[PDB]
Write a protein that binds this ligand. Structure first.
Ligand SMILES: [Ca+2]
Lengths: 144, 138
C-alpha cells in the first residue's frame, strides 16, 4: 500500500533525493548513485543510469577532475504526490575553482511511499520506501 | 521512538555523519551531527574539532576516515549499540579500528529553524554517545 507522511517528511526526502542525484563527487559516487537508485522507481532508475552509461558517462567524463555542487533553493508541494524543486548546480575544477556559470534548474517530481524494503541494506537507507516515480530537471529560464 | 526500522535509519545516519571524515563534506557532516545531538552531546562532539589536535586541522585534506557499520542493536527504552569500523585513507593507509558506539536517543518534534527541519524532520536527538574500541580477545 502507499502512504502519505505530510509536508515536513516529504521535504526531507525530496531534498535528500535531489542532493544525491544532482551532486557529483568522485569520492562519494558510490553513495550518491546507490542512494539515488534506491530512492527511484524502476523507470526512473533507468533514466538516472543513462547519465552514468556510455561514452559521455558522467563518472568517466569528470572522473576525479571535477565536482558538481548542489544548492537547493526551494521546494514546493501540491499535496498529491507532485513537487517542484528549485536548485542550482556549480561545476568546479580539480583545484576547487568554478568552471562555468551557476546553473539554475527546476526538478519536476512525482513521488510516493511504498513501505519498507525487504533487503536489510535498503531498509536501513529507505525505511519508509520513498520512491520517486517521475523526475526531470530542466533549466530555469530567467526572463527579463 | 518511531520503532525499529525508523530508529535504525537515524542511528545509522548519526554514526555515519559523526565518525566520517572528508575535508570536502565537513560542513555537512558536522552540521548534521550537531543538529542530531542534544546540547551536552554537541559539546562532546565539538571537542574533536577544537584545539591543537583538532581533526580538521590535523587531517586537513591529506586524509579521510571511512566508516562501515556492521550492526545495530536496540536495547529498547531509547538505548542502542552500534558496532562499526573506521579506517584512514589516502586519495588504505592505516589499520581498521573496531569500535562500539553506546547510544541514548529520543525524538523531540520538528525543529523551528527551517534549515534544521529540512535535515531532521522528526527532531531525532542523540542524548548520550560514547565510541569505545572493541577489544577482540582470543
Ligand atoms: Ca573528498
Amino acid at each position: 500500500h502507499e502512504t502519505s507522511y505530510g509536508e515536513v517528511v516529504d521535504r526531507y526526502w525530496l531534498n535528500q533525493y535531489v542532493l544525491n542525484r544532482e551532486n557529483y563527487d568522485y569520492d562519494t559516487i558510490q553513495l550518491n548513485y546507490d542512494t539515488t537508485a534506491l530512492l527511484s522507481a524502476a523507470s526512473v532508475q533507468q533514466e538516472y543510469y543513462k547519465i552514468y552509461d556510455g561514452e559521455n558517462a558522467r563518472d568517466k567524463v569528470l572522473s576525479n577532475k571535477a565536482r558538481i555542487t548542489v544548492k537547493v533553493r526551494s521546494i514546493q508541494l501540491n499535496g498529491l504526490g507532485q513537487a517542484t524543486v528549485r536548485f542550482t548546480t556549480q561545476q568546479l575544477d580539480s583545484s576547487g575553482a568554478t568552471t562555468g556559470p551557476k546553473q539554475h534548474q527546476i526538478a519536476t517530481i512525482g513521488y510516493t511511499y511504498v513501505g519498507a524494503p525487504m533487503k536489510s541494506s535498503d531498509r536501513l537507507l529507505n525505511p519508509l520506501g520513498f520512491q520517486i516515480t517521475s523526475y526531470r530537471s530542466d533549466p530555469e529560464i530567467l526572463l527579463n
